[PDB]
Each structure stands twice: as C-alpha cells, then as structure tokens.
Amino acid sequence: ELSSIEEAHAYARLLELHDLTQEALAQRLGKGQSTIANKLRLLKLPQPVQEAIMEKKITERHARALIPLKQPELQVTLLTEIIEKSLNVKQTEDRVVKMLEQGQR
Amino acid sequence: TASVALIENLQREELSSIEEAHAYARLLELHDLTQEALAQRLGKGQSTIANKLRLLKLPQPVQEAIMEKKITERHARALIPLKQPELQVTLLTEIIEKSLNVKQTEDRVVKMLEQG
DNA sequence: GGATATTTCCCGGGAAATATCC
C-alpha cells in the first residue's frame, strides 16, 4: 500500500512508458479511469498539501476537496484548519463552498 | 510464539471475515488477553473483534458464503437479528439470487421480524 | 468521437455508543 500522491506519480510514468489510455491502465489495474484521473489531479495541488498526503495527515478526498479553491493560498490555509480541528471530508467540502461564497461577495 | 507472528501476518494480509474471526479466537486462547488489549495490539476496536466473533455462531451455509466472497461481513451480520437459522439461510439465498446490497438486506430483515 | 477531466454519491468496513453479561 502507498500514498495517493505516490500512486499518482506511478500512474503518470506507466502512461508515458507503455503508451496506454487511462481507461486501459484502470482496466489493467482493476479500477476506473475516474479513479486514475482524480488521483493525477492531486499532482497539481500545492507541495505542502502533497506532503500531508504522503505523511498520511490528510486523506485523498481531503486534498481533492481543496482543488475547487483554485488559489494555493486558500488551499494551504484550510489544510492547517483540517489538521488543527481534525475535520472530516464531509465538513471539509462544506467549508470549501462557504469560502467560495465569501470570495464571490 | 511462532504461530502468533503467522496469524499477525494472516491478519496483516487479506483474509475472510470468518477466517479473521477464527484467527482472533486462537490469539485470545494463546496469550489469554482481553478483546480490548488484542484490538489495541492489532490497531482496531473491541467493537470490531466482538462483531467478527459473532459470525462464528451464524449457520455454516452463511459462513461458507463469506469464505467464498459471495456475501460481505455486514451482509452476514445483518442476518443475526433473525435469531432462527432457517430464516437466515432463506434470506441468504435471496441476497445471492437478487444480488441485494447490505442497506436493502437490513430492510428485508425488519419486514420478516414484523411478519413473524 | 474518443480520451480525459470533474461532479456526485453509493457502499460497506469498522468503530463509537450502548446494552448486557459474569
């Protein structure tokens, strides 16, 4: 078993080296393209977030919930709150939508 | 002492809920420890262990379905409320036939307790 | 049009909360 970030870093290589479609890799791995794509999106998140995934301090779906907050600053601010308050994914997703509303004011 | 490390590895590696339960039982006979202390040693809760040990009381037909990976733990656990083995095995085959999930298996259970 | 990115939410493990037993 490995970190979502490290699993993503792996998939990336395999898709470069074996000239596969995400679908064909997922079929080869026993997953869905959905799963693979979503994990590859994590490689675009801030390094501080990525390090928290590797250190097993946040979950995949925790980090994935931050992406909607397109600004790295807002992602890392919440990251530390999720750690501090020990927030779940459900209330992390809730927190996100409230910040996007505050931003649109 | 040696058999301990074996099961710890058979536990660390993936196994059937029935076989995980059969394992726990032995470990509690071998070190004579409390469910709490084993769970703490394994990194689980006593809750989890106790619930898995309850599966060893379910009908053999149900237990075989767990090992053969035809039903889930929570599928078999949902049958226990139906205290009669006959009613548990009747639903077992329906869950297989209709390919029912746990949510609608739990629902089915309550309806049979109302009927009986 | 196929591949890929994104949104939504179904699903059951498994543990917290609880009741019961010894």
Added chain:
DNA sequence: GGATATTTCCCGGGAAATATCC
C-alpha cells in the same frame, strides 16, 4: 465493575455520471 455483546451510523474510497477537451 470490567469484559463482552449489540446497536447505530460515521467515514472516505472509488466509481458512476457527467462535462470538457483535443
């Protein structure tokens, strides 16, 4: 009173549904 049995439901993986891209 502690251990153990039982009930309840929290939790996030991960894939279906969907939108978007090339």
